[PDB]
Amino acid sequence: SMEQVAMELRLTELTRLLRSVLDQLQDKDPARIFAQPVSLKEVPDYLDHIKHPMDFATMRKRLEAQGYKNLHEFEEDFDLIIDNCMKYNARDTVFYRAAVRLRDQGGVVLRQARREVDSIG
């Protein structure tokens, strides 16, 4: 149908905007701490601690399959990155501190993303 096409064009354009958001958030991680999945070879107990692991490569795979329907879904995954790290790692660690800085800096990007998503529809 023509409606299915219009809906698909909307999803494609959301995917475009989320790709730019993802790039901007990942620039706030210049140490690449959050770039890839926590290795279960190197942290064999990880899944005993963290039930829903997340990282920027995993988000990018979902995004490119157009697997984010709305901004809320994308934000859920970004918050997982931060929240997983802040539980597994202690406050005095470079990991925890990276997550705090990513959260604080990402907030700004996500605030305007939400306005754009609502604005463009």
CATH number for 49: 1.20.920.10
**Are the beta carbons of 29 and 98 closer than 8 angstroms?**
yes
Among residues 67, 81, 68, the alpha carbon closest in space to that of 38 is found at 81
AA identity, residue 91? R
Q: Are 14 and 35 in contact (CB under 8 A)?
A: no
Kindly calculate the radius of gyration of the chain based on its CA atoms and give it in whole angstroms: 16
Phi, psi at 73, each rounded to 5°: -55, -45
> What is the domain range of residue 1?
1-121
User: Experimental method for this entry?
Assistant: X-ray
Would the CA dihedral through 34, 82, 16, 107 be positive or negative? negative
Q: Closest by alpha carbon to 52, among 72, 70, 29, 79?
A: 79
Q: Which residues contact 104 (CB under 8 A, 6 or more apart)?
A: none
- Say how far apart CA 77 and CA 30 lie, in whole Å: 19
Specify the DSSP class assigned to residue 33.
Answer: T
The structure was resolved to a resolution in Å of: 1.5
Task: Please count the structural domains in the chain.
Answer: 1
What is the C-alpha to C-alpha distance for residues 95 and 82, in angstroms, rounded to an integer? 10
